[PDB]
Symmetry: D6
Subunit: 131 residues, 12 copies
């Protein structure tokens, strides 16, 4: 929207630590809007997808997805929700690839996410039906 | 966005009739987003404030305000909600002044709208406390 | 839809009584669908608008409008709902013209109907804002 | 109803990709009604039953069936609901034939769909009881 | 249905007292169906419409009408419900004719009863729209 | 009640197909009342017991039994409710014995139906306690 | 029942005060059951109807009537409920006779009590319809 | 209470069939109250504990116990409830004994019944804690 | 219970101010229990009944009475609840004596308090029925 | 509180039976207050902890604990609640020690009881964390 | 807590406009807390109590009081809640002293606020009982 | 806040027993707010983390975390909530390290705690994602 242009969070992330990158985003003023907070938090999830993190990104994405469901943002800003859902599905598929013990417990969450993605943009989500 | 982009709709209202302006907006091809429909509908409320109409604009604004409350749009896009609430309060205080018999039935709805406006931007709403 | 083409029930209303016209409508076919029932019942409300009746038509229309709200028919078949709402508003305005004692108790119902009509087709409803 | 007459969408699926077929539908326009959206979405489910897809069609059909249940469309437009339920059962059965591990978890959903189909048109749904 | 054929109960009301007529009905063979009880209670309401009583008949009819609403008897046995609603409306109109102070408090109950009668058999109820 | 006397429907099932027998009943109609619909649907379940069908009859009976529970029919017209539950238990006791794997799977429901039958006519149901 | 058979409570009331008669009752011994408590409390209401008290008896009776409604005692022990309701109606009619200011606020309570009495034993209650 | 004194019903069970005993107990002759019905139904459960029956008695007792819970009869008439609960527990312990497969599913129901018995009369229930 | 024995606080209200007496109470030693807080707060209400205060005592008593209702203290410690209810009734009667404008709005609260007092100890409350 | 001082009840348990001891307690005045009943019932649970009983004591304690939760007695009289919870935990730990098959099903109940004890008096409960 | 120390905001209100002062606060910079937002918003209510404003201050205070009720801030930070409630009561009393038309509608809100203040600090609130 | 400065309580746990340390805390004396109680209880959880205890600390922390959720303390005082959640996570990870049987049942609680920590301060929580 405006507060989503941070590829310098990505700089900080690589030069300094991952905590420093997030700490930067948290510090960024003069944050007021729940819109700007959610977007800032999406950056945090995006930056956590660059190096290791993953589990952190999954936690961050789950929170954004839950807030999006409440605020019914699939109607106003669908591209943002599609992104969150797709990122969440991608990472869950990797977590499900590492260990098959959780593949069974992650299966309902993944089916729901795919259903959600199909609901937002079927054409875009069609490719994601086959893993 | 792009819908709100349409000052030509306002011209149609003056050249042709008021129905023609709404019919054109209604006509125009075509919205799909549950969002952009709301923006198109805001233009309708705006165009209905340009000549007489008023009661039409009040009905239109009440609908937009009610959808905004459900979608909790005061958080995402507050300036739009502030506009809707303010326009609605202007036209209500008006209805309550045309005649004084309705001044009393409306009073709770007006106080709620003012509360809402103060909640969004108290600085901007401050001027609206004294009529 | 199919079982809507019945102007002969209107002749029955003129030649024979009003009870005969409705009684004819009630028996008439091998009616099944809730669609056909609702349409058949709309004919009853339409035929009750021809001679005196009015109060009967208002009762009939209130029922159809209530079923339409439940079935969320404003989305699927809006023209039919617009018709019901408009007919209901026309007749309530006439009942409100006869005696001003009920004008105050009918005022909320009439505003709601107009709000509903505006919601379905603003351009079409615009003309109905001024009584 | 009107925007259902699209067999050219099926051609696009064969000439271009499956995504191309769906995206062609996603931009009608000037799609407005929840009716025309649901019908357009049915075409998407129909087109997804032509080549591979299946899982996509099942997701699409589950959404349509869920919306039909809410809108209580089994009463108004039963043939459309029957189609959705029957298509859903057919594909569910095929998924149940491929792997018997999910046959046990799909069994409640399939019994419910059959019960629903019988409820709509028992004569038509009689043939589907024996697997 | 079977235990409805009691015109002798009407004789007892004229020969002995009204309490004696009801007291007899209350002591019929040990029939227990809620059907037989409701019918027996309808006879009580019918017998209370013969001499003075009225207020007793109104209380009796209100009870039957309330039980019919719960048991959704307007669907199974509509003629009986129509009878109860019509008798209830007739007597309320008479109570409304005696004193205009309660005419305003009885007005919602009477409109609801008429709406109910119209819902059961419009043709039959049509005549009851004009008082 | 009146439209229950249809043994010719049973002939159609043997001469023509099973679909034809059900299609006939639907056809006939000349149905309206939710009473006549229910009864007609009870004939469908009866005709589905004659040749194979069974699963179709179980689905049909369950629907009738569920409608009976809602309409609280074990009070007004209990004999019929007994018939539905009894036929339903009878067919399920058949499913049992055969594939006696679920049949343990079954037993709770089967329990309900016996409890249900006892509650209506304990004397009549007494014989059914021992299989 | 056999708790019921005190008058000696009635004796204490005339000999010693009214507080002394209740004080005796209150001290059981030994009450256990809610049946015995309710019965004991009915004696208290009965004893409060002997000399002045009245307002005390009304309070006592209102409590018993409310507990009877909850415990659905109109079914098991109707004579006791009839007694409570009748006593309550009698005393309310007396309070309504003293001052006409409360006659209007007591009117709903009295109509409900009469409706309740009619529901328990119509024959017995019939005489109470006319004041 | 009055219609409980029936040991001749027990004779009919031995001389004629079990159906005849229940059928004879169904020959009222003057049922009205829900009290008399519940007591009559207790006799049926008692008579079903005499020869085989058991499953019959269990169904009968479950119904009485469920009605007692609704009517909160543990407070008014606890001895009758204690009898029902104890008889129910006895016969469930027996079913559980016959097959150690339903001992696990009957365990919650049996613990609740014992808890209920302990709640009514601890001293009397104490002996039933050890099976 | 232990920290209830404080007539020394009554002194501080006469020697120093009323604020000093309450501030002294709020101070006290190391209280922990919600019991000790409620009792301390009762002392505050008692001390506010000595000089003017009244409105303060009413506010204090309403709070204690509301907490007693939640904690269902009428069962455990009824004497304390009786005291609170009686003190509250006494003061409301005085407030109702000063101005008859609030007598009508205080009437429901006073009847409920008396009903509550009667419920706790009828004998003790009997004297309070006549004002 | 007053009727808690009963060590003679413990003698009766040893001299006569366990039923005799409980039967003794069930008959002792002023058997009224829900306080006195709960305390009397605590003595019953205490006496059931002396010889065998155990399962009886567990049932008795569960009832007292449940009533304490409703009456929110952890606030007013925490020592008594602590006693009940601790006794309940002690006996459940013994039942778990006898057979480890139920140790897993008793584990949630025991964790909740310990949490409850810790909440009442952490210092006192600290010792109970290690079994 | 930290961002509460702002008397310069009060100067801006006198030098520039009331909107300039509020705006200045809304600026921050770069708070998140969500403590701050409530504290910052309290400063806005405080600054609105200096010149005219009042109605603005009332809306601001109502919002803070409502958030405090949700967050149950009367427990954590009572002095701040006391301030809000007291300020709210003061201003409502003045709005009452301007026109007696709203005195009656403001009366419940004022009694509740006083009750709330008494609940936080009785001693401090005691002085506010007399207007 | 004020009563948080207690490192002497930690000495008591080393010199005397753990019970003595907690026993000192309760006898502050004598905290009066819910804030001071929660802080005092945090000290108890902190002191239980020094020697063995652990299970005690987990119970203490679960209580504080649950109260923080109710009081929505993550907004006002996030550092304290972060501490509680982090301490709770640390100890659960240790309990999960000791035995892998509970690792699967503790997994949902640990994910929720981490999600909560990430929600409070993502940067701070980032380090805790990888175990």
């Amino acid at each position: 929207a405006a507060l989503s242009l941070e590829p310098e969070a990505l700089q900080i992330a690589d030069n300094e630590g991952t905590e420093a990158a997030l700490s930067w985003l948290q510090a960024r003023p003069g944050i007021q809007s729940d819109r700007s907070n959610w977007l800032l938090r999406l950056l945090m999830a995006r930056v956590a997808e660059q190096t290791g993190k993953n589990d952190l990104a999954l936690h961050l994405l789950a929170e954004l997805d839950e807030r999006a469901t409440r605020l019914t943002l699939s109607q106003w800003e669908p591209e943002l929700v599609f992104e969150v859902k797709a990122r969440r599905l991608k990472l869950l598929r990797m977590k499900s690839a590492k260990t098959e013990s959780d593949r069974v417990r992650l299966q309902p969450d993944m089916e729901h996410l795919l259903a959600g993605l199909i609901a937002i943009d079927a054409a875009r989500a069609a490719v994601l039906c086959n893993s």
